[PDB]
């Protein structure tokens, strides 16, 4: 009963272009510092060997796993040690330990040069060779995002050649291109942050957590899908993610297709909105199905309380399959409330779990769990007043001013975190203003809950690598679903000794007037953070004073005939007045 050669099953099923694409992504994520040219060699080689195993299945090595073959090739890289250190001892291990070891060196903050894309040299390179322009893009996104969802990477990379196909024929390439890549670039970062949380769930909270996520997400989109169908799409959707998150990129891709294919062939029992989606070429259909509008709530739905609170058999039901009965609750809940954010529904079910565990203990469980829904109904509203405040502060200050607002709020909160992580997180938190505060009122909170969890997950991820605040560790490990309130309930502690003053953190040169705009703000926001690790009690009135004092200074010195002499003299002046005002 042996369908023998895994490389050959995959090469056939995906076809060559997708095989090559996915292989280049996989090498790109394992070795992020490597030049492009070296990866193209590793891909072509493995690809030859793939064809040979399609031609002859018995030929040597054609039965080795996909890791072993991927792994064999990583081990032959002349520059693994003197380029990747401790990584080249992975080569001393056997399968599957050798593969675990490679993964664990994926770098979530790789140090990579910022692509300042220029449309002329860039439109130059797509005409020269469209298929390599295509690969270079794959490799550049994937090496800076090493857990990127890989079948989507091909999707976007095609969308991308798509822009150049339409824009390099116009009379102002520039004016045509940059708005489209920029709208594109935002969707890609959002999609990578999404995937990164999917993988954190499983790696850190179990398959049970991801799976539970898909019940929420699915039930909500496909409320007229009955539970067994939902259950089924869930099984196959957790598998696709598990494999994606584990670097099994070829199995993942092929299993997403089989699912895209299963969904479209079962429209009538799943949802009525898919008919347009179920009609594109492969990449686009899958993206369509993941982007698709939600279906209508069936009309005569039996009130929630029926099965889950009055049922004189709840505890019995629950004990016989805890996870199914809870999945069932999540299904039931999610399909009736497509308004809610997932993070919220998964928080509703978790609380619901906690209630049976402890009610089912007591002699009269029914007296205990009959009342759960009010408990639950109060969960929704805890968030709401957070929202109002932050959108006011946001409208009040604008995006930049709000980022510095968060930078201060979050540095007093978790002063130990490193300065680059505090900057990046606060910037991203502040864009949640622009994302969510112009939305309809009853929609602002769901929006907010949803992205915070991508952003809080990035904080944990950046921070689990080099663990230094106990506060953050606790909020990251304690729960998946309760991070946002765990991070909002944190206070500035008086258990933090201020950082000793460091001159080099508050010295500025004529370069500051040179930087790209993002860089300029990031240089300033760093110094903002370093100022609050040093002067952690400094008031809001005082900081107001410093920030203005600081704007004037940069303005002043970015205008003079000798800027260097201008920073030299005014720099120390600034330090003095600040030290005085704050100390």
Swiss-Prot record:
Domain of life of the native organism: Eukaryota
Binding site for Ca(2+) 2: 13, 254, 258
GO biological process: cellular response to calcium ion starvation; cellular response to starvation; negative regulation of mitochondrial depolarization
Residues binding Cu cation, per UniProt: 3
Coiled coil: none
Modified-residue entries (N6-succinyllysine), positions: 204, 563
GO cellular component labels: cytoplasm; extracellular region; extracellular space; protein-containing complex
CDD domains: ALBUMIN (cd00015)
Disulfide bridge partners, by residue number: 53-62, 75-91, 90-101, 123-168, 167-176, 199-245, 244-252, 264-278, 277-288, 315-360, 359-368, 391-437, 436-447, 460-476, 475-486, 513-558, 557-566
PTMs per UniProt: Phosphorylated by FAM20C in the extracellular medium.
Annotated positions of the N6-methyllysine modification: 533
Quaternary structure note: Interacts with FCGRT; this interaction regulates ALB homeostasis. Interacts with TASOR. In plasma, occurs in a covalently-linked complex with chromophore-bound alpha-1-microglobulin; this interaction does not prevent fatty acid binding to ALB.
Role this protein plays: Binds water, Ca(2+), Na(+), K(+), fatty acids, hormones, bilirubin and drugs. Its main function is the regulation of the colloidal osmotic pressure of blood. Major zinc transporter in plasma, typically binds about 80% of all plasma zinc. Major calcium and magnesium transporter in plasma, binds approximately 45% of circulating calcium and magnesium in plasma. Potentially has more than two calcium-binding sites and might additionally bind calcium in a non-specific manner.
The family this protein is said to belong to: Belongs to the ALB/AFP/VDB family.
Designated name of the protein: Albumin
Lineage: Eukaryota, Metazoa, Chordata, Craniata, Vertebrata
Gene: ALB
């Amino acid at each position: 009963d042996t369908h023998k050669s895994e490389i050959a099953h995959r090469f056939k099923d995906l076809g060559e272009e997708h095989f090559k694409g996915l292989v280049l992504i996989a090498f790109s994520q394992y070795l992020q510092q490597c030049p492009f040219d070296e990866h193209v060699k590793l891909v072509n080689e493995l690809t030859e060997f793939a064809k040979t195993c399609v031609a002859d299945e018995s030929h040597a090595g054609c039965e080795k796993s996909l890791h072993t073959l991927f792994g064999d090739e990583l081990c032959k890289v002349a520059s693994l040690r003197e380029t990747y250190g401790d990584m080249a001892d992975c080569c001393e291990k056997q399968e599957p330990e050798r593969n675990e070891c490679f993964l664990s060196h994926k770098d979530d903050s790789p140090d990579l040069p910022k692509l300042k894309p220029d449309p002329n040299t860039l439109c130059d390179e797509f005409k020269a060779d469209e298929k390599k322009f295509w690969g270079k893009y794959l490799y550049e996104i994937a090496r800076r995002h090493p857990y990127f969802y890989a079948p989507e990477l091909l999707y976007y990379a095609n969308k991308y050649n798509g822009v150049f196909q339409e824009c390099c024929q116009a009379e102002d390439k520039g004016a045509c291109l940059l708005p489209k890549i920029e709208t594109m670039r935002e969707k890609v970062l959002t999609s990578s942050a999404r995937q990164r949380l999917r993988c954190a769930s499983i790696q850190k909270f179990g398959e049970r957590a991801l799976k539970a996520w898909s019940v929420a997400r699915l039930s909500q989109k496909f409320p007229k899908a009955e539970f067994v169908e939902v259950t089924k799409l869930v099984t196959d959707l957790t598998k696709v993610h598990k494999e994606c998150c584990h670097g099994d990129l070829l199995e993942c891709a092929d299993d997403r297709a089989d699912l895209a294919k299963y969904i479209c062939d079962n429209q009538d029992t799943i949802s009525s909105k898919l008919k347009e989606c179920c009609d594109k070429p492969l990449l686009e259909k899958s993206h369509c199905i993941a982007e698709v509008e939600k279906d209508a709530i069936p009309e005569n739905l039996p009130p929630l309380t029926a099965d889950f609170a009055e049922d004189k058999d709840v505890c019995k039901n629950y004990q016989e399959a805890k996870d199914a009965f809870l999945g069932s609750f999540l299904y039931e809940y999610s399909r009736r409330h497509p308004e809610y954010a997932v993070s919220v529904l998964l928080r509703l079910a978790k609380e619901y779990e906690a209630t049976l565990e402890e009610c089912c203990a007591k002699d009269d469980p029914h007296a205990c769990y009959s009342t759960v829904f009010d408990k639950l109904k109060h969960l929704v509203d805890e968030p709401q007043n957070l929202i109002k405040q932050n959108c006011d502060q946001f409208e009040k200050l604008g995006e930049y001013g709000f980022q510095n607002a968060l930078i201060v709020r979050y540095t007093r909160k978790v002063p130990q975190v490193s300065t680059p992580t505090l900057v990046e997180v606060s910037r991203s938190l502040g864009k949640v203003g622009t994302r969510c505060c112009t939305k309809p009122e009853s929609e602002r909170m769901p929006c907010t809950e949803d992205y915070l969890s991508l952003i809080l997950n990035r904080l944990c991820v950046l921070h689990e690598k080099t663990p230094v605040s106990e506060k953050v560790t606790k909020c990251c490990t304690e729960s998946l679903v309760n991070r946002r309130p765990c991070f909002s309930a944190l206070t500035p502690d008086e258990t933090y000794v201020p950082k000793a003053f460091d001159e080099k953190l508050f010295t500025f040169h004529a370069d500051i007037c040179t930087l790209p705009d993002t860089e300029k703000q990031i240089k300033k926001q760093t110094a903002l953070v370093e100022l609050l690790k040093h002067k952690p009690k400094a008031t809001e009135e005082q900081l107001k004073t410093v920030m203005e004092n600081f704007v004037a200074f940069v303005d002043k010195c970015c205008a003079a005939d000798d800027k260097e002499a201008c920073f030299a003299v005014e720099g120390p002046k600034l330090v003095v007045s600040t030290q005085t005002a704050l100390a």
